[PDB]
Design a protein around this ligand. Structure first.
Ligand SMILES: C[C@]12CCC(=O)C[C@@H]1CC[C@@H]1[C@@H]2CC[C@]2(C)[C@@H](O)CC[C@@H]12
Length: 243
């Protein structure tokens, strides 16, 4: 099982937000820690992506682009899995030191987005997603958003995406049950993109608002949210849907 061996081997370990849980649950303090968590996870997403089978076949500029468009969906999908396995879905397990209860969902001013993230987390239980299915679906999310004008070497991207779809098929197969499962998992994958889109809109709006009041985001987050996220929000970069 070479493919699943690799995915299991490179899966990132635990990452803490660095949140001081004895300060009060203010909008400012919670988003400060969420943004730091994202900056810390970005490091792990890059190292994970560069170690995926075939990823280095992509042109170097495409490698960075695909990471810089897919990170929100990757991170939300992983957080949903952590929540499913750690608190069983009525809380959101962003990190061991940053677990959202209903009060923090409200004070962060992200309550509706957290509701949707809780729903995604609960789908891992409703569908009885296996660790192998989770790992292959998460890898596919890296190959599920691209510029409408294409990548520098789109042909290699298309072949790589094809092969990750084949791997998902293989895990399901390892025929009427297979077909239903594949439909369920591809419907689950598609449901990540609208959630990520909402969070992309939110974080852009907050970066603008924070800049107005002279509070800076972490370095890599501020660059990606001002250079790459607006390409998503303006329609120059679009998700690839199955259905
Ligand atoms: C990806 C993160 C941080 C990592 C994670 O577990 C998922 C979570 C989803 C909400 C994101 C957050 C990073 C910081 C963001 C983007 C805030 O600016 C607004 C929404 C937050």
């Amino acid at each position: 099982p070479i493919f699943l061996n690799v995915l299991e081997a490179i899966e990132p370990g635990v990452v803490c937000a660095g949140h001081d849980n004895n300060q009060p649950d203010s909008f400012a303090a919670l988003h400060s820690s969420l943004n730091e968590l994202g900056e810390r996870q970005l490091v792990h997403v890059v190292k994970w992506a560069k170690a995926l089978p075939g990823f280095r076949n992509l042109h170097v500029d495409d490698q960075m682009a695909v990471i810089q468009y897919s990170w929100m969906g990757l991170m939300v999908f992983a957080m949903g899995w952590r929540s499913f396995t750690n608190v069983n879905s009525r809380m959101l397990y962003f990190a061991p030191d940053l677990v959202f209860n209903e009060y923090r969902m409200h004070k962060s001013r992200m309550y509706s987005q957290c509701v949707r993230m809780r729903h995604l987390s609960q789908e891992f239980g409703w569908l009885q997603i296996t660790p192998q299915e989770f790992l292959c679906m998460k890898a596919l999310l890296l190959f599920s958003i691209i510029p409408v004008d294409g990548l520098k070497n789109q042909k290699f991207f298309d072949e790589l995406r094809m092969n990750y779809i084949k791997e998902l098929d293989r895990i399901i197969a390892c025929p009427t049950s297979c077909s239903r499962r594949f439909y369920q998992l591809t419907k689950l994958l598609d449901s990540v993109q609208p959630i990520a889109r909402e969070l992309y809109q939110l974080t852009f709006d907050l970066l603008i608002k924070s800049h107005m009041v002279s509070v800076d985001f972490p370095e890599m987050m501020a660059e990606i949210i001002s250079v790459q996220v607006p390409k998503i929000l303006s329609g120059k970069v679009k998700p690839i849907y199955f259905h």
